[PDB]
What does this fold into?
Amino acid sequence: DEAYKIWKQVTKKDRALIAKERYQLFANNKLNVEEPALLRTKAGMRRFLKSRREA
Amino acid sequence: GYESTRPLRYGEASLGPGQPLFYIDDEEVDFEKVINAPLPKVPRDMTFTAHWLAVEGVQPSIPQNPTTAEDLLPKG
Amino acid sequence: NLNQIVTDYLKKKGFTRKYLKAFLLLKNWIDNNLDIYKFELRKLLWPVFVYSYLELVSQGYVDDAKHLLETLRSHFEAVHQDQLALLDENHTTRLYRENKYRIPLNQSLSGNLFHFLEREADNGGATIIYILQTHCSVETSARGPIEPYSFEAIYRRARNLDLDEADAHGVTNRDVLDTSARARDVVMEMQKVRENRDRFVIEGRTGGIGIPVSACMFTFHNTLGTVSCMDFSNDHKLVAVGTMDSYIRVWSLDGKPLKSALENEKNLKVNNRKLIGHSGPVYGVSFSDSSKLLLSCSADGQIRLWSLEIWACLCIYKAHDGPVFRVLWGPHGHYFASAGWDKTVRVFTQDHASAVRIMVGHDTSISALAWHPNGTYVFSASDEMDKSIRMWSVITGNCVRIFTGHTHYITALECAHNGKILASADTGGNIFIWDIEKGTLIKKCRGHGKGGIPSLSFSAESNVLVSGGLDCTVRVWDIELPADPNQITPDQISAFATKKTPVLKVRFTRMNLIVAGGCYDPE
It folds into this structure.
């Protein structure tokens, strides 16, 4: 296709970063206690609200 | 007679140096003025809305919540 | 020295030194499963019923057997008409007794069923376990779930395979696999289930922080300060407000029409209604254990009972001299309590016009009420020169516990779901946590402003508390801080500020989620 190729070209870097974070969190099927916690913030919700207004 | 919506005013008289007296401010009016006056404005009917005050312990920055500009977290 | 006084007083006083419940439980559980399994589990419905009915006929409970047969006849009216007619000793019954039913099932499905039955053993699981162990044989197979269009049936039909002996034997997989288109260790299985379930228990709390919580806020507009009291129904479907204009207003919380049983009111479209009939300001509203009944109390000194199906008053109770301030349904909703200006606490049942119990001993007006989750105790608080909390037994009518320590007007009382802890709040911003059996204060929580904390609520496990205040804040409190791993008190987890809306009601759901209500004042 072409839309799929453009989507990959646009999202590759962010997807790689998120995959790396998730992979580091659960190494050896054990919850690594030294990694950052999973917490919700206000900047992320502001980004979500921006996207929702776009929609 | 204490449910009136008129403003409460006071007038001052003098019994001498440093001896003031206070009286309620009234004034005779016509019946034409009272009867012909317009009515106050009717407020809208009761209703309710909904919104998210917090999500998983974090308040979102939506119009329905207070702004950060304007003592909630312990600092001991 | 009060200890010496008490010791002297004690020394001088001579003190020395049936089957339908199980069927419905199973039906609901089957209804709540994934679709891909629903074909198999339904095979359990027909046997569990039939044998059960016969059992009653064997025990002489003819009326119960008839009621059970009639109630469940609708579910099978389209298939088992002949069998139902025959049942309503024959050779068929003898064959049923001699030959035990066969119930083929998948391995994982069997494991899920056994774990579910164990998890609800005392609510009806034991009945089904016994029935299956006695008059059934669940031939388990390691196949996948069987459906008319699943992979198993398609593959078997395409390859023209034969019928397995276990699944050979009123609908069966044969009619799905026929060309016309192992054993068991119950009891031992339950033992293994319990032994394995015992291995995944959490037994402490060292380190970490409190629990995240979500909140949903309902705001009322154009009230002009006429709203006195607010309440939510048990299922979060209705909201009621009592005003200073003597009327009550009820709304559906999702905006759908409210329904009336009157013929003239058939298919009427309104989502809010008014209850009229009090002569003074309303100070309390209480939903009964869908909610059918409402209780209200007013400054005119009366208590009124309303039907929420026809939206009219049913009964008036007139046992008070002066205004009534608070009224409360019991934990299961047949008894209720009331209190107000004349310093007496009254307990009624909806059956009788006169109060059945009278509680005397407070020296001032009553300002707060609460029930115990077992339904046999009540809590009251007074103001002014007597700022104490009293605990009353309903069987005798006497006081059993007194709690002292508040120095401000008390606004709320709340008992934990485990029946062991009590909480109170006042107009100074403090929350007191009390041990009930010892009569001692466990601790104090600080951080709210001054003015009054009208509402408190415990979570399902009673390990977290949520409070709402007239300072326009909602706060969350840890009831026990974690062990040390080696103006505001450190046991607060969260505080959420509202937008110019004092909080009147807060309540916990089944999850880590709370609902709050209030009135908006733009000025």
Summary: Chain A is about 65% helix and 0% strand. Chain A touches chain C at residues 40 (CB under 8 Å).
